[PDB]
Write an enzyme that holds these catalytic residues in place. Structure first.
Site, PDB file in Angstrom:
ATOM      1  N   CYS A  73       3.578   4.605 -14.169  1.00  0.00           N
ATOM      2  CA  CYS A  73       2.284   4.152 -13.685  1.00  0.00           C
ATOM      3  C   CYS A  73       2.223   4.292 -12.156  1.00  0.00           C
ATOM      4  CB  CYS A  73       1.780   2.847 -14.199  1.00  0.00           C
ATOM      5  SG  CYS A  73       2.720   1.486 -13.883  1.00  0.00           S
ATOM      6  N   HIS A  92       1.086  -3.195 -13.799  1.00  0.00           N
ATOM      7  CA  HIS A  92       0.548  -2.036 -14.201  1.00  0.00           C
ATOM      8  C   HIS A  92      -0.615  -1.384 -13.200  1.00  0.00           C
ATOM      9  CE1 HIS A  92       0.387   1.590 -17.069  1.00  0.00           C
ATOM     10  NE2 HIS A  92      -1.146   1.549 -16.935  1.00  0.00           N
ATOM     11  N   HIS A 112      -4.055   7.131 -15.849  1.00  0.00           N
ATOM     12  CA  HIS A 112      -3.020   6.115 -15.593  1.00  0.00           C
ATOM     13  C   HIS A 112      -1.864   7.128 -16.481  1.00  0.00           C
ATOM     14  CE1 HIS A 112      -3.232   3.394 -19.404  1.00  0.00           C
ATOM     15  NE2 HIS A 112      -3.729   4.683 -19.508  1.00  0.00           N
TER      16      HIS A 112
END
Length: 115
Positions: free
Chosen positions: A31, A77, A89
């Site tokens: 990520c 994240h 993402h």
């Protein structure tokens, strides 16, 4: 903003690429690696490597194209904002780089800006 759109365009270009823990591109991503790659490719230096640090660096964002969205404090994240409520993402092992509505994470989130 043009630099913001550039970062978004680089992130979008990676849609479909496989997730790999430790990946920062060009073909494999985690990520935070996708965030780092997208900035470096546009000459936007100064972005840290890991999610918790990316959530703390730069300046406050608004969620405009190319801002970094982070999830949690400390953050676990991150993604690149599209500017419309969604992000690009690298989701997790076993998924590919994709667009997701930020609301669908169902957790706390904020925005940083590195450009």
């Amino acid at each position: 903003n043009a630099s913001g759109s550039a970062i978004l365009n680089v992130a979008k270009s990676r849609i479909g690429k496989q997730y790999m823990s430790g990946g920062t591109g060009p073909d494999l991503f985690d990520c935070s690696g996708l965030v780092l790659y997208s900035h470096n490719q546009c000459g936007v230096y100064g972005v840290p490597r890991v999610a918790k640090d990316q959530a703390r660096g730069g300046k406050a964002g608004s969620g405009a194209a190319g801002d970094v969205v982070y999830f949690g404090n400390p953050a676990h994240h991150v993604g690149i904002c599209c500017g419309d409520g969604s992000m690009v993402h690298a989701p997790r092992p076993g998924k590919t780089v994709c667009i997701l509505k930020i609301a669908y994470m169902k957790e706390s989130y904020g925005y940083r800006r590195y450009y």
